[PDB]
Amino acid sequence: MIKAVVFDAYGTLFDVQSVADATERAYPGRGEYITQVWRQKQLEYSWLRALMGRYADFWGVTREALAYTLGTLGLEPDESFLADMAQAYNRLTPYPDAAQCLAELAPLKRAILSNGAPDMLQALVANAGLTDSFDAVISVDAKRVFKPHPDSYALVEEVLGVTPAEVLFVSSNGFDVGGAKNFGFSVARVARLSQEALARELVSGTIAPLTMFKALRMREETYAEAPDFVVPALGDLPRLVRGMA
Amino acid sequence: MIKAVVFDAYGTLFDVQSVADATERAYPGRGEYITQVWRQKQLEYSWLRALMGRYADFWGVTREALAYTLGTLGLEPDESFLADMAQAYNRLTPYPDAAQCLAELAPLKRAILSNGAPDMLQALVANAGLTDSFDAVISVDAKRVFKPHPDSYALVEEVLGVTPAEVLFVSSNGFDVGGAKNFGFSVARVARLSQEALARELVSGTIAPLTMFKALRMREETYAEAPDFVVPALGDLPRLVRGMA
């Protein structure tokens, strides 16, 4: 019944914190801040452009989010600076177990469903050495919407020929788990932050900035349907497909 | 030309930080964290439920966002605790110059356009003694969307009989400013946080949690059209209108 495993890209297969060395150059001493706000604003702008009916591809969203973030620090970077710096998003490091996971999943059909513009995804996947791990790398761009709009998830059937019930959708992002579940896929959430660790981290004197972002982005969202499955890592997927309901 | 002044409610006419006593009661020592994450998640859930096509009114959104927020701390509140604590959002205090601004705006049409569910807005407006200050208190609920969806702003002409070009929309929220501008209204943004202050606050030693929320929510959003006018407080609106554009 599961004929295909479809993966979210940013934050699920690829580490969005991996732009850290490059952002710590835009503002020495503020790389950590920049990395978090940039990701947060990229997500917010994807949602707000889509809800307004004013789509622009993820490359433009990524650059607009970066401009906002650097603007908070008092900077006014020009477009050429922004485009150069935003290339960091096309070189994100894959999670260490992604390649082993994707190889052990075959012979299932393997794919990505991402907000990324087509060129961004091509570079990201190839730079990570994973182009031969996917049957299809689907961008939402043809639909002019962003996850979790249902039309973004509709592309899976269009491109792959499989129905929602035959797809295992994989994401570490709570909003994306909710959209996929809403659309009708079976969902495996990748939870890298134990709830109990976050609770204690929040209760320990200092509430650092990094903790704030973890609290906003690494949990299941309350409005959302629960994922069918939750694993701590991508490497557990193949075994999950083997014996789990 | 301007015939009606339409205001966003939460964050604009009413202070969302005024839930501080209720939150400090929910978790002594974590009141400020809860306030901020609750507001952020309320906004995210409004956008994500709308974008998914799975609307729930703002009373459900507010409680869902509160459950999430208390859950990050390791709590598991039952529904009655959530409904009870969420009433703090129906008791928000108006900004100190709101009463005076509204009084000076008659006899122009005065209205609210908010995400708030009809019961919520009724009780919030009554509590602040401002019921006779508005010609209409419009909830997005009949359209079953949330701002900045275009159908939310379409309600203004439906209810008031004035066209977009005859409306001055007032918000302190960058996404709502963008939504209203996209829709065709003239927009006056209320900017309570000088940009230069934020830039220095952020470069000043360790970044406090409260600063993170300011950085995410108090500026103009980069994907949005710029507002027509920017004022530091609601009290400046009357004078802005007599000498406006």
Side-chain angles (χ1 to χ4, degrees):
Chain A
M1 272 142 266
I2 291 308
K3 296 184 176 190
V5 192
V6 178
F7 294 82
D8 166 53
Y10 308 104
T12 297
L13 285 167
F14 309 88
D15 188 354
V16 308
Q17 301 300 316
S18 78
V19 301
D21 293 346
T23 59
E24 178 68 26
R25 289 235 180 254
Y27 213 110
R30 273 314 166 313
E32 291 153 343
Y33 167 80
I34 292 170
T35 296
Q36 303 308 313
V37 176
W38 186 6
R39 172 59 176 164
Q40 181 60 29
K41 282 283 159 183
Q42 174 192 72
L43 288 179
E44 294 187 7
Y45 289 3
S46 82
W47 307 331
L48 293 161
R49 268 183 168 289
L51 197 48
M52 269 196 326
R54 293 297 151 211
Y55 176 84
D57 76 28
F58 216 52
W59 183 237
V61 165
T62 293
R63 286 180 289 152
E64 279 160 351
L66 178 60
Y68 177 90
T69 303
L70 303 176
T72 61
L73 301 170
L75 305 172
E76 293 298 322
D78 68 19
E79 182 53 54
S80 170
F81 185 92
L82 287 167
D84 178 73
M85 182 164 183
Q87 292 287 345
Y89 255 91
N90 291 340
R91 320 186 245 282
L92 305 179
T93 295
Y95 281 96
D97 53 354
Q100 76 205 45
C101 165
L102 286 160
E104 306 184 338
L105 275 182
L108 256 352
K109 274 220 234 177
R110 300 158 316 172
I112 281 168
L113 174 71
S114 172
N115 278 344
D119 306 351
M120 292 180 67
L121 299 176
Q122 279 154 27
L124 180 66
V125 167
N127 290 342
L130 296 172
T131 318
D132 298 318
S133 294
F134 296 108
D135 299 307
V137 174
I138 312 155
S139 168
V140 294
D141 196 55
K143 295 287 189 174
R144 300 204 305 208
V145 298
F146 283 118
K147 302 196 282 183
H149 185 116
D151 270 295
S152 75
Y153 302 103
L155 286 160
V156 181
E157 177 146 29
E158 300 179 30
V159 179
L160 282 189
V162 296
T163 67
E166 287 167 337
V167 183
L168 176 70
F169 196 92
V170 179
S171 183
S172 74
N173 290 285
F175 74 94
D176 188 41
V177 167
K181 276 303 294 173
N182 169 106
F183 196 80
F185 298 138
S186 290
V187 168
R189 174 175 158 244
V190 187
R192 301 194 174 92
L193 172 71
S194 333
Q195 295 187 280
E196 60 264 43
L198 172 68
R200 292 188 288 266
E201 181 180 342
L202 288 171
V203 111
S204 77
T206 155
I207 292 177
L210 185 56
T211 301
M212 194 56 52
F213 292 101
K214 290 180 183 183
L216 292 176
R217 297 265 67 83
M218 308 211 302
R219 320 287 285 318
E220 291 166 5
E221 309 297 344
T222 306
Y223 69 86
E225 286 166 63
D228 293 84
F229 314 106
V230 182
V231 289
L234 294 166
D236 305 297
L237 288 166
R239 171 145 310 240
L240 168 74
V241 174
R242 286 359 124 165
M244 245 257 176
Chain B
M1 249 78 197
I2 289 302
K3 284 173 164 145
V5 190
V6 185
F7 304 77
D8 172 53
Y10 306 113
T12 297
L13 285 165
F14 302 89
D15 189 354
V16 306
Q17 302 288 331
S18 74
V19 304
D21 272 39
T23 57
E24 193 52 28
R25 274 191 277 160
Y27 208 118
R30 280 300 173 255
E32 279 138 74
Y33 165 79
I34 295 170
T35 292
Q36 300 319 306
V37 173
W38 189 6
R39 170 68 176 163
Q40 178 63 26
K41 281 292 163 174
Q42 177 192 68
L43 290 178
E44 292 187 4
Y45 290 5
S46 77
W47 305 328
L48 290 167
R49 264 182 169 297
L51 195 48
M52 267 193 328
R54 294 292 163 86
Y55 175 91
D57 71 24
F58 213 60
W59 176 246
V61 163
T62 295
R63 294 175 284 150
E64 277 157 356
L66 176 71
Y68 177 90
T69 298
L70 302 173
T72 63
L73 299 171
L75 305 174
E76 293 293 321
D78 60 25
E79 184 51 52
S80 145
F81 174 103
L82 291 168
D84 207 350
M85 180 171 176
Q87 289 289 341
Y89 256 93
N90 295 332
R91 291 186 230 113
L92 303 189
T93 326
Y95 277 90
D97 58 348
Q100 179 176 46
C101 163
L102 287 165
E104 285 170 14
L105 293 187
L108 289 168
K109 284 163 186 208
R110 292 165 300 162
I112 280 164
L113 181 65
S114 170
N115 286 335
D119 285 349
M120 281 178 89
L121 293 182
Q122 218 206 330
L124 174 74
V125 164
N127 177 259
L130 291 178
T131 321
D132 303 302
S133 275
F134 294 102
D135 296 299
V137 174
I138 317 179
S139 167
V140 295
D141 194 62
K143 301 278 188 183
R144 295 183 200 176
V145 295
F146 282 115
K147 299 191 272 188
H149 189 295
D151 297 11
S152 67
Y153 306 98
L155 288 156
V156 173
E157 190 173 357
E158 297 188 10
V159 170
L160 287 180
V162 290
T163 68
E166 309 183 294
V167 172
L168 179 70
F169 194 92
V170 185
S171 195
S172 80
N173 291 289
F175 74 92
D176 187 36
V177 165
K181 279 300 295 177
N182 164 63
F183 195 80
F185 299 140
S186 270
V187 174
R189 176 172 164 247
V190 193
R192 300 192 174 89
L193 174 66
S194 330
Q195 287 189 292
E196 55 265 44
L198 176 65
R200 280 185 305 259
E201 183 175 348
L202 283 167
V203 76
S204 90
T206 61
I207 296 161
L210 169 59
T211 305
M212 297 305 330
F213 288 104
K214 296 191 172 184
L216 291 182
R217 298 263 69 80
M218 307 207 303
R219 327 280 298 312
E220 289 172 3
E221 314 290 346
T222 309
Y223 70 87
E225 294 160 60
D228 298 84
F229 309 105
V230 185
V231 295
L234 294 159
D236 298 295
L237 290 165
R239 215 144 154 111
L240 171 78
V241 175
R242 24 240 100 144
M244 78 207 314

